[PDB]
């Protein structure tokens, strides 16, 4: 998937930053069975007071989480993991979680590339990252924390 | 919902940034009855010249309001609410419309969170907000103008 | 269309954001049809380290193009268009195929709006182009590279 993460400049410290990564990432992998590597964590950063809410300008707290993922999972799947991600960017950022907002869009996985290579199905990760070449295999393989 | 709001930098000025987000929140409010201090508008910023159009490097004048939705709406009701945001951000920010571009994405409430809580369907926003705690509804009732 | 496209500060040059802006727009008309001038394409950089991979910080190499589409087209046709957006960003940006992850999200043509005006659906852009009045369609003309 990617979760592309919006939030205010020199809100989220770079270890702050790692921390929120590495939580998205580990319960994207724990919920779905997706390696590690297949999760891109991107953060976007404003400057504060670039959110709004009802008209009111906001100071620097939210944090607007919106992952694209494969179609075909359940609703309850896709609610735990949004649950686990307010939960644990919460626990990961220091941030209450009434200032947290997470939304979800799905995309047949026919038309997602990553890595430059077309997706699996969310069951066949396995036999696909097999019949990638050598480097290509190697290359994700770095990409685990 | 959430309103990305895409310009560049130093086009709109903080009371620009007010104008343009009041205008699509009281157009989103108008239109579906979702209470103010459910719709978060985000200015994401970039210097100009970041816009191509058929390839053709741009100054700073697009707009490009991305919606995301909740299911369940009419194709008549996005319609004129796709079309309120054009005319009253062009109002707003004193821009001529041609350079506002405007894309709804829809996705189940199931998969959606704001201010921490799965968000209702759309005619129910008020059993909902009834639900909540006190200090949930407080520090929601505050984004409100 | 609205292609977002997710890269580091610093890593494409003017010359470089060009070349890739106009290897999507030209891959895009090729392969739908749609006219340069409704082909737009918006850079979004943040500083290199914002991407996580597996939550592993990266440096300033990963490009992500988000697409978004009209409705309509075959899945084949949109992986003819993934693919050679893959292969014609490499070329124009210089850079490694396995660097680049390209997603496709699709809205009903109905709620989708370019230069304040309602998109037709696919294939239909010719007669849509015709009924626009002068300053409109002159304005649009200006956008082709």
Do not use: C
């Given at each position: 998937?990617?979760?592309?993460?919006?939030?205010?400049?020199?809100?989220?410290?770079?270890?702050?930053?790692?921390?929120?990564?590495?939580?998205?990432?580990?319960?994207?992998?724990?919920?779905?069975?997706?390696?590690?590597?297949?999760?891109?964590?991107?953060?976007?950063?404003?400057?504060?007071?670039?959110?709004?809410?009802?008209?009111?300008?906001?100071?620097?707290?939210?944090?607007?989480?919106?992952?694209?993922?494969?179609?075909?999972?359940?609703?309850?799947?896709?609610?735990?993991?949004?649950?686990r991600?307010?939960d644990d960017?919460?626990?990961?950022?220091?941030?209450?979680?009434?200032?947290?907002?997470?939304?979800?869009?799905?995309?047949?996985?026919?038309?997602?590339?990553?890595?430059?290579?077309?997706?699996?199905?969310?069951?066949?990760?396995?036999?696909?990252?097999?019949?990638?070449?050598?480097?290509?295999?190697?290359?994700?393989?770095?990409?685990?924390?």
């Amino acid at each position: 998937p990617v979760y592309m993460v919006y939030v205010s400049q020199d809100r989220l410290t770079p270890s702050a930053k790692h921390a929120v990564a590495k939580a998205i990432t580990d319960a994207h992998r724990g919920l779905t069975g997706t390696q590690h590597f297949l999760a891109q964590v991107n953060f976007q950063e404003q400057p504060a007071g670039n959110v709004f809410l009802g008209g009111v300008q906001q100071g620097g707290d939210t944090i607007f989480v919106h992952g694209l993922h494969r179609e075909g999972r359940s609703a309850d799947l896709k609610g735990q993991l949004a649950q686990r991600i307010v939960d644990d960017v919460s626990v990961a950022a220091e941030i209450d979680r009434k200032h947290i907002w997470v939304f979800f869009g799905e995309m047949p996985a026919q038309q997602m590339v990553e890595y430059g290579r077309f997706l699996p199905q969310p069951g066949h990760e396995g036999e696909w990252f097999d019949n990638l070449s050598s480097d290509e295999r190697a290359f994700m393989e770095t990409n685990v924390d």
